[PDB]
Write a protein that binds this ligand. Structure first.
Ligand SMILES: [Cl-]
Ligand SMILES: [Mn+2]
Ligand SMILES: [Mn+2]
Length: 175
């Protein structure tokens, strides 16, 4: 087995995923239950995290649909200091980010385990700050909620970051 110069398989406790080879580990504690964080040091809005949290649920489906799940983890999307209505008349219409557009979601079953994935375009209060593309994949096993969230800014997304964000999240697998 030779080294891939683009994607790096990473094995953690109970999970594995592909991490971009040119990204580096981050010691920033961003979210509850964080066990991994990697970032593009030359654009830190490109980053990924793996979180492992306790949950009362048995399956990701116990949260409801992918859209329901997103509403229950919307702290992943932004750090707004208040719960607020967005200006959408449907879809994501309220939470802790100023604006969120759900682009797509999916419910892949892999090795007999139900995963959710959801892709969301966000903005904050100052629209002098660029929009972000955030992809969240998640599953539940053994009393734990496993989350992989990867993201990149709009411009970086269309200059190759898409591949890395979507690959990281879609590769995320729990034993
Ligand atoms: Cl965007
Ligand atoms: Mn708007
Ligand atoms: Mn965009």
């Amino acid at each position: 087995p030779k080294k891939n110069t683009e994607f790096m398989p990473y094995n953690g406790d109970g999970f594995k995923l592909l991490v971009p080879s040119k990204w580096n580990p981050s010691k920033e504690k961003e979210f509850p239950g964080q066990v991994l964080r990697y970032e593009d040091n030359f654009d830190a809005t490109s980053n990924l995290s793996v979180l492992v949290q306790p949950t009362d649920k048995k399956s990701i489906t116990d949260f409801g649909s992918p859209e329901d799940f997103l509403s229950q983890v919307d702290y992943l999307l932004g750090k707004q200091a208040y719960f607020g209505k967005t200006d959408s008349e449907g879809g994501f219409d309220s939470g802790v980010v100023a604006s969120a557009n759900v682009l797509e979601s999916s419910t892949p079953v892999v090795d007999g385990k139900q995963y959710y994935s959801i892709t969301v375009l966000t903005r904050t209060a100052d629209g002098d700050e660029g929009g972000k593309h955030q992809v969240i994949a998640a599953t539940v096993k053994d009393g734990k909620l496993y989350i992989c969230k990867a993201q990149a800014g709009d411009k970086r997304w269309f200059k190759g970051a898409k591949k890395f964000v979507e690959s990281a999240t879609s590769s995320f697998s729990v034993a």
